[PDB]
Amino acid sequence: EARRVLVYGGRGALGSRCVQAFRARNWWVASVDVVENEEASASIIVKMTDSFTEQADQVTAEVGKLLGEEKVDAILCVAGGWAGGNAKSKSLFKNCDLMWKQSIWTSTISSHLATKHLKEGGLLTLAGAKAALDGTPGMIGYGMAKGAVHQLCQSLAGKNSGMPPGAAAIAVLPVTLDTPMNRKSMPEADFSSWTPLEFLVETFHDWITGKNRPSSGSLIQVVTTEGRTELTPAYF
Amino acid sequence: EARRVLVYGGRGALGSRCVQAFRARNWWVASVDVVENEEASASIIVKMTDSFTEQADQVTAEVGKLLGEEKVDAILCVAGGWAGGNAKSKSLFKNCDLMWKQSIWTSTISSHLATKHLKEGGLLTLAGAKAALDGTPGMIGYGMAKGAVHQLCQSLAGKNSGMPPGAAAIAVLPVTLDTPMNRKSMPEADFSSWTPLEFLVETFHDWITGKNRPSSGSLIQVVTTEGRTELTPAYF
Numbered sequence: 001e002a003r004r005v006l007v008y009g010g011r012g013a014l015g016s017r018c019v020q021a022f023r024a025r026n027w028w029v030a031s032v033d034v035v036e037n038e039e040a041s042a043s044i045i046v047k048m049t050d051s052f053t054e055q056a057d058q059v060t061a062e063v064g065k066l067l068g069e070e071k072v073d074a075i076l077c078v079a080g081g082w083a084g085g086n087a088k089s090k091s092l093f094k095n096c097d098l099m100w101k102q103s104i105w106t107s108t109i110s111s112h113l114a115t116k117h118l119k120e121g122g123l124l125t126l127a128g129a130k131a132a133l134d135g136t137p138g139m140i141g142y143g144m145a146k147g148a149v150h151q152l153c154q155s156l157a158g159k160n161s162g163m164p165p166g167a168a169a170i171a172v173l174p175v176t177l178d179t180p181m182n183r184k185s186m187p188e189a190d191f192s193s194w195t196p197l198e199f200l201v202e203t204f205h206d207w208i209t210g211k212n213r214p215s216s217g218s219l220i221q222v223v224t225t226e227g228r229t230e231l232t233p234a235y236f
Numbered sequence: 237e238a239r240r241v242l243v244y245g246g247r248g249a250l251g252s253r254c255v256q257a258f259r260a261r262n263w264w265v266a267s268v269d270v271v272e273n274e275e276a277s278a279s280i281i282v283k284m285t286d287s288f289t290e291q292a293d294q295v296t297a298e299v300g301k302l303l304g305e306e307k308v309d310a311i312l313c314v315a316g317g318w319a320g321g322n323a324k325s326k327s328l329f330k331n332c333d334l335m336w337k338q339s340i341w342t343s344t345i346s347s348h349l350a351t352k353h354l355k356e357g358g359l360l361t362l363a364g365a366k367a368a369l370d371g372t373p374g375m376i377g378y379g380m381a382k383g384a385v386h387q388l389c390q391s392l393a394g395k396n397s398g399m400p401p402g403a404a405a406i407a408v409l410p411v412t413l414d415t416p417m418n419r420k421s422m423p424e425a426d427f428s429s430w431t432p433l434e435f436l437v438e439t440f441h442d443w444i445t446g447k448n449r450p451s452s453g454s455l456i457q458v459v460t461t462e463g464r465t466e467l468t469p470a471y472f
């Protein structure tokens with residue numbers, strides 16, 4: 001069963017496709033991002049601040065007054081983006097900071113809103129990266145950000161983490177998504193190895209409506225070889 | 237060979253024992269912390285800021301003008317501390333923020349100063365936690381902070397990460413250290429399972445002076461059962 005989904009990163013490439021797709025099925029969808037999703041049922045704009053508790057408390061408070069005593073079926077934390085760099089690079093502190101606001105702050109706020117507003121049996125999805133299961137020398141801030149999302153996935157499947165009875169926390173782990181910005185960025189890239197966003201919107205639909213939902217704490221790899229996308233469990 | 241060690245967290249429980257101990261051997265020791273270590277050969281005070289690039293750039297710049305074209309034998313990032321909490325807790329955003337400034341920001345700055353100022357063959361130590369190799373439900377910010385240090389350890393052992401030829405990046409992974417603050421905190425705890433700080437100061441001495449140094453990217457567990465401390469490799 002579904003009807004109430006919260007998308008954290010509602011105005012990103014993947015996030016707006018999810019907001020379009022569940023709104024198409026007439027579901028109540030709220031968007032959480034730094035810009036309004038006028039297409040969502042409700043947007044929450046995240047405050048641009050260097051303080052994490054300020055950003056955190058403003059979203060937790062905005063979401064609490066929007067939902068009151070109403071639980072949602074899913075929270076999809078699709079928030080993220082990318083930046084490279086090895087430890088010697090001059091863009092290292094800039095890029096690390098982007099990566100952590102984008103992946104660590106959003107995943108952490110999403111995990112607190114799920115213990116408060118997820119339904120029993122509800123779903124929470126986190127965004128990982130397959131590359132971060134091994135070291136990432138040329139993506140230090142990215143690899144670190146994403147490894148912390150994988151370890152957090154495990155904590156939330158642990159006993160007494162805050163999570164509702166029956167609720168699952170799954171970490172999705174792509175390699176590269178198909179996005180217009182990626183296509184003009186890696187113009188010689190073999191787009192056939194890029195995952196369509198639509199496949200993940202279908203996967204998210206199924207996991208929400210009970211069909212083939214992974215176990216809590218699962219790390220799912222999303223790999224597309226020659227236009228076909230497989231799903232492969234990974235262990236922390 | 238040793239003579240120049242940089243201790244990041246020079247004024248913490250472990251860090252000041254390291255600064256005392258190598259200064260005892262007449263080594264040049266610099267301290268990096270939020271308070272001066274008048275006992276160190278040189279202290280750098282870290283700026284209290286919510287901006288990471290500001291804190292980062294002020295330490296990188298202070299250390300660069302203190303060393304000029306001089307490399308150091310080791311960088312010991314012992315910076316850290318602890319706070320608990322599951323995802324539903326009201327102290328969650330407070331504690332996550334502490335954990336990330338303390339473990340993620342310091343480990344990340346230390347990894348950039350090592351690519352710039354570590355000698356070929358030099359050592360870099362990072363502080364992990366054994367608990368963060370599995371999920372940590374009642375220590376969400378801690379487990380995440382420490383998992384990112386373990387993944388960063390792996391990236392730095394990867395090819396072309398910035399790290400000097402022959403240099404190693406090892407992640408030390410305790411359970412509980414023996415500290416006066418821990419003893420009055422867990423007064424019924426069996427202190428016999430707590431690692432003496434002195435054992436790690438001896439271990440750090442050996443790894444710096446070539447004796448039994450682990451391979452780069454290694455995760456070492458530090459476990460003390462009944463006053464005896466063993467060292468056990470772990471794999472990411």
Ligand SMILES: NC(=O)c1ccc[n+]([C@@H]2O[C@H](COP(=O)([O-])OP(=O)(O)OC[C@H]3O[C@@H](n4cnc5c(N)ncnc54)[C@H](O)[C@@H]3O)[C@@H](O)[C@H]2O)c1
Pocket residue numbers: 008009010011012013014015032033034046078079080081082101102105106127128129173174175176177179182
């Ligand atoms: N090639 C890839 O796109 C690729 C590769 C590996 C992993 N993934 C991961 O999949 C996820 C989605 O991919 P995507 O292409 O849609 O990324 P995206 O950049 O297109 O969408 C991310 C959206 O989330 C928002 N998000 C970032 N900070 C936020 C904040 N502080 N508050 C609220 N929302 C915030 C951003 O503003 C952005 O609109 C990301 O986590 C990404 O890291 C993608």
Ligand SMILES: NC(=O)c1ccc[n+]([C@@H]2O[C@H](COP(=O)([O-])OP(=O)(O)OC[C@H]3O[C@@H](n4cnc5c(N)ncnc54)[C@H](O)[C@@H]3O)[C@@H](O)[C@H]2O)c1
Pocket residue numbers: 244245246247248249250251268269270282314315316317318337338341342363364365409410411412413415418
């Ligand atoms: N029970 C334990 O003490 C225990 C358990 C598990 C892991 N470890 C880990 O071992 C390491 C050392 O243990 P400890 O007892 O000496 O911790 P500690 O608190 O006694 O010492 C940490 C010092 O590093 C500093 N550090 C934190 N933020 C800093 C910053 N922004 N700039 C510069 N330095 C900063 C702190 O000010 C503090 O003085 C820590 O990383 C800790 O997480 C310890």
